[PDB]
From a paper:
The lower residue number for AAVpo.1 is due to large deletions in the VP1/2 common region. Amongst the AAVs compared, AAV5 and AAVpo.1 share the highest percentage of aligned residues (99%) and lowest overall Cα-RMSD value. Both AAVs share very similar loop conformations in VR-I, -VII, the HI-loop, and VR-IX. AAVpo.1 shows a ~2-fold higher transduction efficiency in Lec-2 cells as compared to Pro-5, indicating a preference for terminal galactose. The sialic acid binding site on the AAV5 capsid has been identified previously and the substitutions of methionine (M) 569 to valine (V) and leucine (L) 587 to threonine (T) on the AAV5 capsid resulted in the loss of sialic acid binding ability. For the AAVpo.1 capsid, this is not surprising as there is little sequence conservation with the AAV9 residues around the 2-fold region.
The cap open reading frame encodes three viral proteins (VP), VP1, VP2, and VP3, that form the capsid shell. The AAV capsid is comprised of a total of 60 VP monomers. All AAV capsids exhibit T = 1 icosahedral symmetry, but only the shared C-terminal VP3 region has been resolved, while the extended N-termini of VP1 and VP2 are intrinsically disordered.
Author numbering:
A (entry chain D), B (entry chain H), C (entry chain 2): 198 to 716
Amino acid sequence: GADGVGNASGDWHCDSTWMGDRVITKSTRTWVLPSYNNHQYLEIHSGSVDGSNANAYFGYSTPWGYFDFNRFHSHWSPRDWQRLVNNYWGFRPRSLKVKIFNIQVKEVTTQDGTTTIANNLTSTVQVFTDNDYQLPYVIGNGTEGCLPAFPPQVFTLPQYGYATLNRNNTDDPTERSSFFCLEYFPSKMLRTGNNFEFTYSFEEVPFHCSFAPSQNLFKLANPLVDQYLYRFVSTDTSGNLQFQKNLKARYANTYKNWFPGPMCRTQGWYTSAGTYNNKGVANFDTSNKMELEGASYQVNPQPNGMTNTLQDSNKYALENTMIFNAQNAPPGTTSLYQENNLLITSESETQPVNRLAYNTGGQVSNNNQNSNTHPTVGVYNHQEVLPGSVWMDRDVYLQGPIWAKIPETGAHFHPSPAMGGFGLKHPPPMMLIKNTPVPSNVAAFSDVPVKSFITQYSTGQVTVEIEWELKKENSKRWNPEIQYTNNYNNPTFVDFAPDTSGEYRTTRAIGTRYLTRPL
Amino acid sequence: GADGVGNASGDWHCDSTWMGDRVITKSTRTWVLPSYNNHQYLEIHSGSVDGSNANAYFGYSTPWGYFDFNRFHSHWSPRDWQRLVNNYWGFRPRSLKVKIFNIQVKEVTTQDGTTTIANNLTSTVQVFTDNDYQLPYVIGNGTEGCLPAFPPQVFTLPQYGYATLNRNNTDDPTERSSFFCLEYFPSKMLRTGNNFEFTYSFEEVPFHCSFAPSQNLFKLANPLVDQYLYRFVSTDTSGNLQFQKNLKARYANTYKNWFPGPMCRTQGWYTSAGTYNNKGVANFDTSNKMELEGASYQVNPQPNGMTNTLQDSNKYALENTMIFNAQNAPPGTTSLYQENNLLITSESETQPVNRLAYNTGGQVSNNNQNSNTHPTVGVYNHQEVLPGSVWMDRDVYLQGPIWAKIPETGAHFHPSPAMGGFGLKHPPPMMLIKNTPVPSNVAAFSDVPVKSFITQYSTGQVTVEIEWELKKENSKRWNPEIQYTNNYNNPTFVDFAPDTSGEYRTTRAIGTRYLTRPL
Amino acid sequence: GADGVGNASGDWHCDSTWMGDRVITKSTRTWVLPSYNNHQYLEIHSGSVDGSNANAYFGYSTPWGYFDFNRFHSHWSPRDWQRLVNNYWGFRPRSLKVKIFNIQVKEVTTQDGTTTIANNLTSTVQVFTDNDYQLPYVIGNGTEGCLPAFPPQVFTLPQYGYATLNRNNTDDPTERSSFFCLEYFPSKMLRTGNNFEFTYSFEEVPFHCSFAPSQNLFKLANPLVDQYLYRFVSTDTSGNLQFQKNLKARYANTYKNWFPGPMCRTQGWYTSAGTYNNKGVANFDTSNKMELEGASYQVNPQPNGMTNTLQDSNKYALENTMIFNAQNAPPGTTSLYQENNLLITSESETQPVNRLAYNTGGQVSNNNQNSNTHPTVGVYNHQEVLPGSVWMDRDVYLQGPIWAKIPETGAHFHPSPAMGGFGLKHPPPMMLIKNTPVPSNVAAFSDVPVKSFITQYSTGQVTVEIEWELKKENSKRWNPEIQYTNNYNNPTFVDFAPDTSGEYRTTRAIGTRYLTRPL
């Protein structure tokens, strides 16, 4: 932008603007960027870890870092989120603007145990966006490093890396393994006066459904009126078939037009009461898994179409659950966490249309009845998509992801990501940034590449603006709705606020489904 | 319409008009409307009934009643239906017009065991349509109360009620239970001179397929020509692999492009011969079921994609069958019915592409073969939608439903209702009507609402006009087709006609699939 | 309107329409009108009753009845009210439309213990509005007879009567007592085809404040900074004056710009725990009272400016409280009611700016200090309006009144009615209606007025439409707000819904103050 050393290249924008059918969120944060890998690209790999060869991989770490705004709380204050979920039947993203500005590059020198930091006014950072999706898209896998929830917090940009193909579930590559060089893209170079701006339009995507059903999928018939349909009930002692009319309100017997969503049975576990759970279990051997390339992988939180719990029940299908930490956690922690440390979400709103993850799905005939053979049924633990099936996709959370990239295979079905949010063919592109290397003193020629660099890091601001489209509520429900509310019994701190040490406290996961609709 | 006491507000229209690619049906009937619940809204509920807690519910009954034209015989005479199904490959509804007129409100007084009926010229009825689908949509669940099949028959409008959510499969409500007040809508008020008119356009929907396949899905290859493809046949005594060419007409061995529809195995039962059936069976424990919200429900007639019987066979998968009564039945009857009382439909036309409901679906490899281990297979009793699968949706019947509302969840697959007919996102809206309350003598003030009303009922005519689009047959079949025909051996009455007592007799269910097409 | 016998003169309108800054409510109800006093005007009076001569009065009852829509639930469904109070900082009425239509006049004859009811097609009702406020305005005194909360309920119009002046607190009139004849106004006469319409604009009036303060009136100073002001603290042993700086956050000592509202101390009583209350008290002798014309009257709920309770406390100043019945009650009941029968409102939201009704207001110096005389203070139990005082007026409730007429005296202060709502100089005018008398058989002349009339009553519909202006919330609060929500533990019925007998159940009083604002 050529603002120059003494002129700011942008202003602080954090706001929300509510229009009748649209809302515009604006978020600004301060970032800091290390020089990762000391300006080197490094092959990274691993064999089997923790007794699973699904943990083997081959890939690369890069000197670059990237901006990740793919969580709802990056854009939405808690109050704004409340206003959203209490009043609207749905929402979707429409457009995006990003600005990176007020660049400051610092040099670091260490001498005799003391560290000195100074401006380097002539250094650059490099920024580009991968508009054609030519790089592995690591955004939307639920990884850390997003713009923080709380605007004053200063955050470190995560390092860009990726896994390509590995051979036979080992740490070796294959002939098809790809290396991607990020310097092989055009990128803008910014000194301290320069800035970067980017605009993007979302593709057409369905509204997220921010309502809960007020009817049960199998109870849709008028309770006052019989069906004109008849069901087989019994055989008499001579084997003749006997039938009965399907009476009003007998929902066990009514013919059905529509069927519940697909399910994969998932083990149920009791929360807050240990005495009901089986003691000293190691989950991993009995976890739900899918096989790929000769290895077994955990598939949490299972495909869409189930509910992980019943309302006002302490039993959860944990592998069907999005589980968040109430606090930020250090990288690499292996510590065991307990329920009170975590935010365990509930999909219970969808229980009228989604099957319960920890029960059987149903039963079908498994034999051929005859004079000597009584009819029998088998139960089933999984059932995939059926003609005429309906379900609700997983809810989104203030703490949760927004979008995910639909993999490019040429074939898919119902592209809504398991974690929740908007499946996108062309998502917001990766935004990559790195500190340009500055060599240190070099006296003599060599054909060997320079390895010795001045230690530098950079800092600046980033602004993200998203236009959201809203779907208005159009309910005729007479009695009041359930609404998210700030109710606490004798609080010692304000939730969604900094505490006495300045830590931002969040003790609840807030979903979107409060208002109701009939089916 | 302000016609006035002595002027009719509409005329009787029952006709059909056949245009080349369209047909317009017009139906007029006389209705009678009780004052249900004596102008009160009543909470209705139930616990477990007949040993099933799937029969528990919570809901409301309303003073309103509603017009239900959602059966084919409301619009189609038997002869017209014959003309449709013998000559056309498909049809779909396009537009709708409804008129309610010639309102007559009667007051009823009972004194000393004698009942007197008189006109009340100044009373009103109230009518409205739920255009935004803001109320539970109870139409399209197969319940009674439709416009009668036979035009002179006078019918009672059914009472509007609905089930909302209940708690833990009991008779209690939950926090999410909805109460809907129908007086919270604008509605037109009609005295005896007034009328009501409504028009509606159907959304684009696929033609119903009124043909049967003349080829088997697995027999599509030219019987005169070998495939250029080879199959594994055996291993020799040294374990070497052996292969053979797939020969002409060997349809057991041909490679396949396409696969049959999804299936859920359903128990088969013999009709008209009791000796083959298992004696004294109570079906309910061994019925097919699906689990929802912690309860088990019968899912008849199963999802689309199966056939319930084979042509010229007496074995039926009864829970895969639409079963109608030949006669109208009284409300609430628990009597046992026998086969000769009922119309048991057959989907046998689809047997070349739909799998047979009472057999296994197939078999797949269940182990890993090696030097010491012979290959084995398991059979499967259910198989859901596969890539490249094809099937035919259930046929529609003169006696059967027309449309159903697709539930509003944001996610579904192949929205064609299990019962048969057209799945609609925005179906013809509920048309609701009630007798406006007229208080009786009130001498003194009270803040308590008036409970004492003059007993009234109303009667009038309703006309429904539907424009249907037709898909012309374009067959090159040389030999004659199967056609629905009026063939009876020594009849003692005319079918689809009133008998000596005036009862309208219908002894057959008439489907649509007579003409054939190659695949 | 001259619709005629067989033509409806209006339609049913109950709806709400939400525009961005305005909301339009439309309500329609069915009414029934007795012929009160058999078409006679009657002097009514009373002496001392229950030992209080404040109960003496002189006045008149009229044959007329009147429409009273002066309660919020006449216009607002519970869900709509929820939407209002959760999202907006205020509202006020703007315009009004009323229609009376579908008139039906019935004649009643009783013979041998049996009652017969028939239409009288040629009878009239008479309607007029008192546009110039020339009659005693009885609307807005908290009396029964309003349009019901629940739209299907049919209600009886209350009888119009009024009290004029009485002599010396007895049952006699004075020379200044006024008799008002309602037939001395022009009025429209309606047969069964006719209707009546009226439109009205509200005067400019302040928005009701639908928010609660998030700051305490005495805590407004920055807690991080000292005042530059000093306070007298002590005298030393020689009598010299000593002073100290007012330190940061010491809100006991800070100089104040502003002062709390006016108060009248009111006795506090414990709810739900009887053991803390004084036993067997008769309240009336110790009630708060004001004297007028030589008699003593209870002044509940006291003037504005107090709070009746503290948050999460069981102590209430009951005479400072609006107390509603959860149910409709019969006229004239003397039964004792208990807390669980009643809705006891809480003004606790205003506790940061309004003084607590059951404590003392403060203390002031009551003597002159000197060498021999220690300073003393008296406490005070009442304090009226002070310069620089601020307070919040009483909240409004879904169950409560909307407006009140400011008395016409030429002098008043802060005209907001004690009960809550909008003080209006020219409120919506009285709407009066009566059944025109129809004499019975008269054979001979007399100069004495006819006393013998055919017994008649009338019924019809009334529609009321109000345009409301809204004040949008403009909060920067980061953390979530308190919101009214439909939370019930194991409900056996749906609140704000009809129960199994059809009774409309309301177990909560819903105020407007949920959102917060800083001072």
